[PDB]
Amino acid sequence: LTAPSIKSGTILHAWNWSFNTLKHNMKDIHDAGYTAIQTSPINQVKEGNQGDKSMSNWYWLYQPTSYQIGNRYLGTEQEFKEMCAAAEEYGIKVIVDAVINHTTFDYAAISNEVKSIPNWTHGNTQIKNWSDRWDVTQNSLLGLYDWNTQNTQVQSYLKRFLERALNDGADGFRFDAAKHIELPDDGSYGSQFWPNITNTSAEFQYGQILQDSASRDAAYANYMDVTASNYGHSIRSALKNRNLGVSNISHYASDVSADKLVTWVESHDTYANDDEESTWMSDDDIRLGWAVIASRSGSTPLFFSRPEGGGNGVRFPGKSQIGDRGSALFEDQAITAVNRFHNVMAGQPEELSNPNGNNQIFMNQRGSHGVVLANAGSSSVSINTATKLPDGRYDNKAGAGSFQVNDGKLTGTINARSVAVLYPD
């Protein structure tokens, strides 16, 4: 229900949830078995399109104007502080999405607070060659003004913001566009930006480093955890073909070890961006996806709270607005069961397989303690596989059903499009 550390638990991405909504849905998030929560950017941003709350305006939260805490979309610093305290009341940790690689693109909106720092930016010359580290780190991403991360004065300014969040109650960070901030060994233009701003009391901290050739996943891993963006793609592909074949969904598609990895089925971008890369999915595809990644060992899964009514190609249904609580899926019986499972199996090794050679059925056996089954198939299946679980009756915790282990053999009917969580007590 609550792991001994942010790293051993499941993180709920409260995408666009205001500080007050969060505060109010704390008992629920605790009940659902999450150890940490990830908020949207908590700082002062360029509140575009006249500050309108339509979900389609979500992107304005990634265009900072000053690094003061509080904004119209999510709320005020006091509210943030109050929410961190409400979280702590149930042992929940708070993770802050820190957009520290850039500010807004609208130069006139940038605060004096920012403009006062001598030589604070690199400019807004759009990145051209993505295979070039110099271009990727030293130039403008989307025309968003690029902070001059080599400037110790900007480092200090940005770091005091992190410090302030931690002191407000926060416990960790998700470094937005962390791939666009050079490392020490990043050639002639490296810097001590990471060793510096990473040196805080933050329990857990990881960066969004979308994978490619100039992303250096294994290098950033030496400072913070990294995002397995490719793996997420493998998962979505699997769910797409309804083929949960272990050969493909077992390699994290990265050269970083899973204990320095943050995983997901989809991110706020794949869903919310105009590409609609993962919007196609439905709650059912997400349940099976979660079962697959949140049953793994060592990797920290991040659950994405989609807009009330989103899915099936529909991004912004217009049933909620920025600040409103997301869909109820975050606390579904099947999701909750896997979170609990994920927590209790901490430390346990894993072994993946496909019962009876059926690639539509995913089985994850954590030691001789638990078993997670995911049937992506459109029909029900009766299984009969070996098991390290003791003999006895096991009721499906993720939903309805019972399985019987007998003479080291698992048997039962996993319902179509269903997840099954199996373990004692």
Ligand X SMILES: OC[C@H]1O[C@H](O[C@H]2[C@H](O)[C@@H](O)[C@@H](O[C@H]3[C@H](O)[C@@H](O)[C@@H](O[C@H]4[C@H](O)[C@@H](O)[C@@H](O[C@H]5[C@H](O)[C@@H](O)[C@H](O)O[C@@H]5CO)O[C@@H]4CO)O[C@@H]3CO)O[C@@H]2CO)[C@H](O)[C@@H](O)[C@@H]1O
- Residues in contact with Ca ion by CB under 5 A are 84, 101, 146, 169, 171, 180, 313
Nearest distance from C-beta of residue 177 to ligand X, angstroms: 3
- Residue 179 interacting entry, from ligand X, Ca ion, none, C-beta within 5 to 8 Å by type: ligand X
Q: Could you say whether residue 74 binds ligand X (CB under 6 A)?
A: no
User: Where in 96-115 is the site for ligand X (CB under 6 A)?
Assistant: 99, 105
Place of tokens 């605790």: 30
The residues, ordered by sequence, that sit 6+ positions from 152 with a Cβ below 8 Å of its Cβ are none
> 74 touches which of Ca ion, ligand X, none (CB within 5 to 8 A by kind)?
none
Q: Does 176 bind ligand X (CB under 6 A)?
A: yes
* 315 touches 266 (CB < 8 A): no
Check residue 269 for interaction with ligand X (CB under 6 A). yes
User: Rounded to an integer, what distance in angstroms lies between the CA atom of residue 34 and that of residue 294?
Assistant: 11
Nearer to Ca ion, 277 or 350 (CB): 277
Interface residue with ligand X, options 11, 87, 170, 177 (CB under 6 A): 177
Count of alpha carbons within 13 angstroms of residue 88, beta-carbon side: 11
β-strand pairing of 11-13 with 43-45: unpaired
59 binds, among Ca ion, ligand X, none (CB under 5 to 8 A by kind): ligand X
Closer to Ca ion by CB, 89 or 391: give it. 89
| Residue 167 · residue 77 · CB < 8 Å | no
Q: Considering the complex, state which of residue 21 and residue 101 has its C-beta at the smaller distance from Ca ion.
A: 101
**CA–CA separation, 234 vs 267, rounded Å?**
14
Among 122, 179, 340, 397, binds ligand X (CB under 6 A): 179
Q: How far is the CB of 130 from ligand X (least distance, A)?
A: 6
Q: Which does 350 bind (CB under 5 to 8 A by kind): Ca ion, ligand X, none?
A: none
DSSP 306: P
Is residue 59 close enough to count as binding ligand X by CB under 6 A? yes
Q: Which of 19, 62, 223, 362 binds ligand X (CB under 6 A)?
A: 62
Nearer to ligand X, 144 or 371 (CB): 144
Tell me how far apart the alpha carbons of residues 389 and 372 are, in angstroms, rounded to a whole number.
12
Binder among 139, 149, 151, 208 for ligand X (CB under 6 A): 208
Structure tokens at 308: 């009330």
Dist CA 151 CA 119 (whole Å):
8
**Toward Ca ion, which CB reaches closer, 275 or 351?**
275
Size of the site for ligand X (CB under 6 A): 17
Six token digits for residue 135: 């271009």
- Please tell me whether residue 173 binds ligand X under the rule CB under 6 A: no
169 touches which of ligand X, Ca ion, none (CB within 5 to 8 A by kind)?
Answer: Ca ion
Q: DSSP label at 28?
A: H
Interhelix angle 77-88/152-168, rounded to 10 degrees, is: 50
The count of residues in the chain is: 425
Measured distance CA(213)–CA(110) in Å, rounded: 32
Determine whether 72 is exposed, middle or buried from the number of CB atoms within 10 Å of its CB (0-12, 13-18, 19+). Answer: middle
Please state the closest distance from residue 305 (CB atom) to Ca ion, in A. Answer: 18
Shortest reach from residue 61's CB to ligand X, in Å: 7
Is 316 an interacting residue with respect to ligand X (CB under 6 A)? no
Q: Which does 171 bind (CB under 5 to 8 A by kind): ligand X, Ca ion, none?
A: Ca ion
In the region spanning residues 118 to 157, those forming contacts with ligand X, defined by CB under 6 A, are: 141-144
Q: Which of 236, 231, 292, 295 has the alpha carbon at shortest distance from 261? A: 231
Hey, CA dihedral for 388, 391, 397, 400, is it positive or negative?
positive
Q: Which is nearer to ligand X, 90 or 134 (CB)?
A: 134
Least distance in angstroms from the C-beta of 414 to ligand X: 36
The answer to whether residues 360 and 376 touch, using CB atoms and an 8 Å cutoff, is: yes
The nearest distance, CB 180 to Ca ion, in angstroms, is 4
From the number of C-beta atoms within 10 Å of its C-beta (0-12, 13-18, 19+), residue 55 rates as buried
- Residue ranges that bind ligand X, judged by CB under 6 A: 59, 62-63, 99, 105, 141-144, 176-177, 179, 208, 210, 212, 269, 273
